Amino acid sequence: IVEGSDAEIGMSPWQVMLFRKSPQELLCGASLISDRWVLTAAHCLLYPPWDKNFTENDLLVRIGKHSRTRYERNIEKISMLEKIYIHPRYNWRENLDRDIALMKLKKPVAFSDYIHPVCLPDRETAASLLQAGYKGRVTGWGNLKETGQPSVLQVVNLPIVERPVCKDSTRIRITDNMFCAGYKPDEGKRGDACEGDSGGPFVMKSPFNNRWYQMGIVSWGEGCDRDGKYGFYTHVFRLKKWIQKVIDQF
């Protein structure tokens, strides 16, 4: 996260850390949507261009964390993956379209003050909140500058941006399964996601029932917090049907 700040304890109870067994290192961010399922970005698991292709036994899931590097004994919970599901039509070859993946935890995780799931959006909620100008929240332990990193989980509040403005800012073929966020050059404020924040949650709080809903997934950008550029996120709702499908079947 760039131009963000230290999250407070229990602020993002759904924030998950994808941890690599060997070498032991931060891999990506992810989110808890129930006691057996965590949602993340596909490019975190599969990305041929960089020879990235992890499997169940290569990873560990750490839930309930705040600190980036310490083993928060008695607080965080480490879990093993049982199955990884990459969206069948995930396009890593061209524009990272449908950048989404589901991980099935081996054993259910017990909730607590620091471990709690985030809601997935319904057609109505998404329709009311996913509007240009409306601010959302992003969290992660990723880099703080484009090219030292955070000691503690970071967070930023960014505005959703008009689809047209998103398009005219890149040569990458934008699709309907993705939206962009960030401040515009003259808006005075800045901030963005960055390497290391991938798979992390983009959430919004419903003014109707006060719940937090994950609208997006940290996917891609061009550099970090560059003026004229914006971060892109996977449109959770547009892929909500693939999500449900996976869970009831498996």
Partner: peptide, 10 residues
Amino acid sequence: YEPIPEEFAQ
């Protein structure tokens, strides 16, 4: 990073 207990390396 601070090493994590080996009981979670399967």
